[PDB]
Amino acid sequence: YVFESPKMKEILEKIKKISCAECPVLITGESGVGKEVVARLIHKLSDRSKEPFVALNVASIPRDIFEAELFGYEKGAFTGAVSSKEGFFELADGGTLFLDEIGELSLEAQAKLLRVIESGKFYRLGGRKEIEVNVRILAATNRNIKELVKEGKFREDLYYRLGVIEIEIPPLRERKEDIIPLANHFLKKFSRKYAKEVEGFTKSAQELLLSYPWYGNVRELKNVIERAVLFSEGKFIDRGELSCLV
C-alpha cells in the first residue's frame, strides 16, 4: 500500500499507536477510501497478528436468516441444515471481526448484536452447549452515525461500545498528493500483471487526473488505470485514452 499525504501519515501514526489496545475500533469515510485497508493494517500490527481476520458485510445478509449467520447451527436443526455451520463470531475466535457497512443494519437485529458483545456467550441454533469466544471488533461506516442516532435509526449503546476509538479517512478529492503515486503504482502493477510494456503517463494525461473530481475514489482510480492498461498500445499513455472513460 502507498501513503504519502500528511493526513494519511497522521492516520498511520495513530494506527501504530492504537494497535496495542484491544478496544473496538470504528472507521468512517466515503466509499473507496480504504477503510478495510486501515482495518487490516490495525490487525497486522495488533497482538493478534497471526490470528484470523474475519471480514464480513452485513448488507448482503438476508433479513430472515441473520441469526443463522450470527450464531451458526448444528446438523438437523431445521430444513436445509445439512451440516454444522459456525457463525462469524465463532470463526474469529481469538482474531478480529470486521463488520462493514454497519450503518445499514436493521434496528431489530442491532439489539441482537451488542447483546452477544457484552455477554460474550451464545448458543448455536440446535446446540445444547454454551460457547465462549473473544473477538476484537472493527466496524466500518459510510454515513454519519450520530445523525442516524439523532433520527432514532440506531442504538446509542451500540455506538458507545463501538465508538471507543473512531477514525475519519479523508476522501481522495482532498488528497491530491496521492494521485500521481497511486496512478504510477497501479500502472506498474497492472503492466506487470498483464505482461505488456507500458512505461508511464504522458505529461498531458497527468493534469486530467488532478482535474477529475474522483467520486469512486481509489476504487474508481484503480479500475480506470486497469482499463487504460488493458487497451494500451504503447509505452506512453496519452490523455485521449483516459478521456474515453472520464
Partner: protein
C-alpha cells in the same frame, strides 16, 4: 429460512457406517461370556456346546 416442513427434495446425504459389532472387542472374556449367555437366552436358534 428457519422452519420445520415436510417436503420432497433431492439431497446429498452423508454416510455413517460404524458402531456395529465394535463393543465386543473391549470386553474381557467374562463379560463376553455374559453377553453370549444373554444372546443365547434371547435367541432360540443359538446353542452352546455342552459337556453333559
Amino acid at each position: 429460512k428457519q422452519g420445520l416442513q415436510l417436503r420432497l427434495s433431492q439431497q446429498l446425504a452423508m454416510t455413517p457406517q460404524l458402531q456395529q459389532a465394535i463393543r465386543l472387542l473391549q470386553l474381557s472374556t467374562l463379560e463376553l461370556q455374559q453377553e453370549l449367555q444373554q444372546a443365547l437366552e434371547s435367541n432360540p436358534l443359538l446353542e452352546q456346546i455342552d459337556t453333559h
